[PDB]
Amino acid sequence: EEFVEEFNRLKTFANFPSGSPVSASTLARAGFLYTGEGDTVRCFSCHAAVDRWQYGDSAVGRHRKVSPNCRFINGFYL
Amino acid sequence: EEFVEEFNRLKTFANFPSGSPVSASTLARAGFLYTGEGDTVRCFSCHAAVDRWQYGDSAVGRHRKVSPNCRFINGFYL
Ligand SMILES: O=C(Nc1cccc(C(=O)Nc2ccc(S(=O)(=O)[O-])c3cccc(S(=O)(=O)[O-])c23)c1)Nc1cccc(C(=O)Nc2ccc(S(=O)(=O)[O-])c3cccc(S(=O)(=O)[O-])c23)c1
Ligand SMILES: [Zn+2]
């Protein structure tokens, strides 16, 4: 619905930890919504979550890893 | 399926990192299977994938944060 649009996902990232090594925008571009606790983010499509972001993580890489069959990660939204 | 039994999940943990702060028995108890990569474990029921385990982590608690609607976590398998 709304969260197919990158910008709407990005908007969920109010209060996202300023010091995270992986930026809010990178995480939204990788299909994530911010959960509002920690650096825990959750894909709008597959509903699978990822936390504990470290310098050098690929936001798309870790997503594919946890949800290789995610519709977003495999291009179902274009 | 067969992974409803704890013992069947625990079997998947050979060569799981011996220095893991969270033990193999503890993660199997929390519904996890070992993926065979690093300290990455996946839930047999909700396919959530969690790694980077640290001291103080609850296997169950972390599993519920990443998949609050997990069938395993919510009692589905009785
Ligand atoms: O399974 C899920 N998500 C999932 C499952 C059970 C519970 C939940 C869950 O707690 N969902 C929700 C959490 C939080 C929220 S929120 O706080 O309100 O925003 C949710 C909100 C709305 C809906 C959900 S929902 O319950 O997912 O419906 C939320 C999520 N996603 C998913 C979607 C598409 C593909 C994959 C995936 O890559 N799976 C797999 C991944 C990996 C493996 S592996 O063992 O490595 O071969 C799979 C193996 C066999 C089958 C699969 S399969 O069929 O693709 O599910 C494997 C995974
Ligand atoms: Zn996804």
Ligand SMILES: [Zn+2]
């Ligand atoms: Zn689960």
